[PDB]
Amino acid sequence: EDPFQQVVKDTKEQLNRINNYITRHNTADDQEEEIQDILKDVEETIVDLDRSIIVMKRDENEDVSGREAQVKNIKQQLDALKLRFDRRI
Protein backbone atom coordinates (compact mmCIF):
# COMPACT_ATOMS: atom_id res chain seq x y z
CA GLU A 1 0.00 0.00 0.00
CA ASP A 2 2.30 2.72 1.31
CA PRO A 3 5.93 2.14 0.23
CA PHE A 4 6.78 0.71 3.71
CA GLN A 5 3.97 -1.85 3.65
CA GLN A 6 4.88 -2.94 0.09
CA VAL A 7 8.52 -3.64 1.04
CA VAL A 8 7.34 -5.53 4.17
CA LYS A 9 5.12 -7.71 1.97
CA ASP A 10 7.86 -8.23 -0.68
CA THR A 11 10.37 -9.21 2.04
CA LYS A 12 8.14 -11.80 3.71
CA GLU A 13 7.26 -13.19 0.28
CA GLN A 14 10.96 -13.30 -0.71
CA LEU A 15 11.91 -15.09 2.50
CA ASN A 16 8.97 -17.46 2.15
CA ARG A 17 10.01 -18.33 -1.43
CA ILE A 18 13.54 -19.34 -0.33
CA ASN A 19 12.06 -21.24 2.62
CA ASN A 20 9.82 -23.31 0.29
CA TYR A 21 12.86 -23.94 -1.93
CA ILE A 22 14.97 -25.16 1.01
CA THR A 23 12.25 -27.63 2.05
CA ARG A 24 12.43 -29.16 -1.45
CA HIS A 25 16.27 -29.10 -1.71
CA ASN A 26 17.41 -29.71 1.93
CA THR A 27 20.80 -31.21 0.92
CA ALA A 28 24.00 -29.15 0.57
CA ASP A 29 23.21 -26.82 -5.12
CA ASP A 30 22.21 -24.62 -8.08
CA GLN A 31 20.80 -21.73 -6.04
CA GLU A 32 23.45 -21.51 -3.32
CA GLU A 33 25.10 -18.23 -4.51
CA GLU A 34 21.72 -16.83 -5.43
CA ILE A 35 20.24 -17.47 -1.96
CA GLN A 36 23.25 -15.84 -0.26
CA ASP A 37 22.86 -12.77 -2.49
CA ILE A 38 19.14 -12.43 -1.84
CA LEU A 39 19.55 -12.94 1.96
CA LYS A 40 22.17 -10.19 2.06
CA ASP A 41 19.86 -7.90 0.09
CA VAL A 42 17.12 -8.73 2.66
CA GLU A 43 19.49 -7.77 5.53
CA GLU A 44 20.05 -4.38 3.92
CA THR A 45 16.34 -4.01 3.18
CA ILE A 46 15.55 -4.47 6.90
CA VAL A 47 18.10 -1.72 7.68
CA ASP A 48 16.09 0.52 5.30
CA LEU A 49 12.82 -0.40 7.05
CA ASP A 50 14.45 0.38 10.44
CA ARG A 51 15.74 3.80 9.20
CA SER A 52 12.29 4.56 7.87
CA ILE A 53 10.83 3.83 11.36
CA ILE A 54 13.51 6.04 12.98
CA VAL A 55 12.50 9.03 10.86
CA MET A 56 8.72 8.46 11.27
CA LYS A 57 9.17 8.17 15.06
CA ARG A 58 10.33 11.85 15.05
CA ASP A 59 6.77 12.74 13.98
CA GLU A 60 4.73 12.95 17.22
CA ASN A 61 1.55 12.29 15.15
CA GLU A 62 2.83 8.79 14.26
CA ASP A 63 2.72 5.55 16.22
CA VAL A 64 5.40 3.27 14.76
CA SER A 65 4.75 0.31 17.14
CA GLY A 66 2.86 -1.62 14.39
CA ARG A 67 5.77 -1.08 11.97
CA GLU A 68 8.25 -2.01 14.68
CA ALA A 69 6.36 -5.31 15.27
CA GLN A 70 6.38 -6.06 11.51
CA VAL A 71 10.14 -5.53 11.31
CA LYS A 72 10.73 -7.68 14.39
CA ASN A 73 8.67 -10.43 12.73
CA ILE A 74 10.70 -10.20 9.49
CA LYS A 75 13.92 -10.41 11.48
CA GLN A 76 12.60 -13.59 13.16
CA GLN A 77 11.61 -15.09 9.78
CA LEU A 78 15.11 -14.23 8.44
CA ASP A 79 16.87 -15.75 11.47
CA ALA A 80 14.88 -19.02 11.28
CA LEU A 81 15.60 -19.21 7.53
CA LYS A 82 19.36 -18.51 7.79
CA LEU A 83 19.77 -21.41 10.20
CA ARG A 84 17.75 -23.78 7.91
CA PHE A 85 19.94 -22.66 4.99
CA ASP A 86 23.16 -23.08 7.01
CA ARG A 87 22.18 -26.58 8.19
CA ARG A 88 21.52 -28.24 4.78
CA ILE A 89 23.60 -31.43 4.83
Binding site: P3, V7, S52
Partner: peptide, 22 residues
Protein backbone atom coordinates in the same frame (compact mmCIF):
# COMPACT_ATOMS: atom_id res chain seq x y z
CA UNK B 1 13.49 -21.26 -11.54
CA UNK B 2 14.21 -17.78 -10.24
CA UNK B 3 13.65 -17.33 -6.51
CA UNK B 4 13.53 -13.52 -6.84
CA UNK B 5 10.28 -11.63 -6.14
CA UNK B 6 9.20 -9.29 -8.96
CA UNK B 7 9.16 -5.52 -8.19
CA UNK B 8 11.19 -6.02 -4.99
CA UNK B 9 13.99 -3.67 -6.17
CA UNK B 10 11.52 -1.15 -7.64
CA UNK B 11 9.63 -1.19 -4.26
CA UNK B 12 12.85 -0.63 -2.28
CA UNK B 13 13.68 2.40 -4.41
CA UNK B 14 10.17 3.80 -3.79
CA UNK B 15 10.82 3.35 -0.05
CA UNK B 16 14.13 5.23 -0.25
CA UNK B 17 12.42 8.02 -2.27
CA UNK B 18 9.74 8.31 0.42
CA UNK B 19 12.58 8.30 2.96
CA UNK B 20 13.86 11.53 1.34
CA UNK B 21 10.39 13.13 1.18
CA UNK B 22 10.20 12.77 4.98
Amino acid sequence: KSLRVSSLNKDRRLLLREFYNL
